[PDB]
Chain A
Amino acid sequence: AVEPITIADLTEVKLDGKGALDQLLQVTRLHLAKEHDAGRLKGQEYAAVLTGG
């Protein structure tokens, strides 16, 4: 009953992977994308927030 948690479990290198880091980044991207689609973000705060986070 010992499943070894590995780097693949944390994150595989692909952008669309199923790693925890990957999916957290994806949900952050979705929230920012909706914010930009509404008239509330320019295309530069989008990058600033992500890089900070």
Chain B
Amino acid sequence: TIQLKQVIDLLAEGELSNIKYVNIDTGALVLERVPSLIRAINLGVLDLHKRFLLKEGMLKIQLEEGRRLYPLRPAYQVGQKPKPGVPQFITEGNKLGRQSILKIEKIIGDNGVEYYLNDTWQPLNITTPEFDVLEISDEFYCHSSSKTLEVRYRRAPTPMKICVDNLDSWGCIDIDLPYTHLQALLYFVASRCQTPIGFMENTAQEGFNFSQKYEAECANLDAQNLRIDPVGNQDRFTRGGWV
């Protein structure tokens, strides 16, 4: 799910050719606003991961009786930096970053049971008070019989860190996307970049046009169904009674 930054910039030359970002007026060649370009591209990738799943992750929490709030932050995760004031209870899973948890979706115990999420008055309900923390009531401990939990969630990739010495290559950087959403990302970046420039009648509408094309492309990808989509088929016949 990777692409070389080099190809990205080479192609975006073909749509940013009007403006400062990439071209000297004479002998059009990429400038050194690459930091700003990368900062825009990362935002674009995050937006696409918002619009389509494209990823999912997993964790594994080791429970502790009498605990009320379990935050999911990169200080509690094994292999991260062990801040002394916190016990590292996240013992397994994808490496956590600043933007990794877009939404928690499933919680599965060690017994194979499936707990309920934000479904009030359900038997063993788990509540998220702050979108990145699990609130576990005492009734859960009363009737849990589970020593660990497994969490699944919608992911977004962690962007690679650029550096002033890394300004040498900038071509070994790898964006984490399939190529389809690359074609879409081009329009996103072009719109954002071209919006605040131009004072002539037809040159004041390029940002708007690129926004329109970006939306159209997103609709086309949805129609073609180039993203993950689970579909549920329960049994309903093993409960005992429907047969």
Q: A-side interface residues toward B, CB under 8 Å?
A: 43-45, 47-48
CB distance from A19 to the nearest CB of B (A): 22
Q: Which of B196, B198, B199 has the most C-beta atoms of chain A within 10 angstroms of its own C-beta?
A: B199
Q: Which of B30-85 contact A (CB under 8 A)?
A: none
Tell me the complex Cα distance, A14–B199, Å. Answer: 27
Which 7 residue pairs of A and B lie closest in terms of their CB atoms, listed nearest first? A44-B199, A48-B199, A47-B199, A44-B198, A45-B199, A44-B197, A43-B196
Q: Which of B158-214 contact A (CB under 8 A)?
A: 196-199
Q: B-side interface residues toward A, CB under 8 Å?
A: 196-199
Tell me the complex Cα distance, A48–B201, Å. Answer: 12
Q: Which residues of B contact A48 (CB under 8 A)?
A: 199
- Residue on B nearest A51 in the bound complex, by CB: B199
- Residue on A nearest B200 in the bound complex, by CB: A48
Q: Which residues of B contact A45 (CB under 8 A)?
A: 199
CB distance from A49 to the nearest CB of B (A): 10
Q: Which residues of B contact A47 (CB under 8 A)?
A: 199
Some 8 contacts from A to B, beta carbons below 8 A apart, are A43-B196, A43-B197, A44-B197, A44-B198, A44-B199, A45-B199, A47-B199, A48-B199
- Residue on A nearest B197 in the bound complex, by CB: A44
Tell me the complex Cα distance, A43–B196, Å. Answer: 9
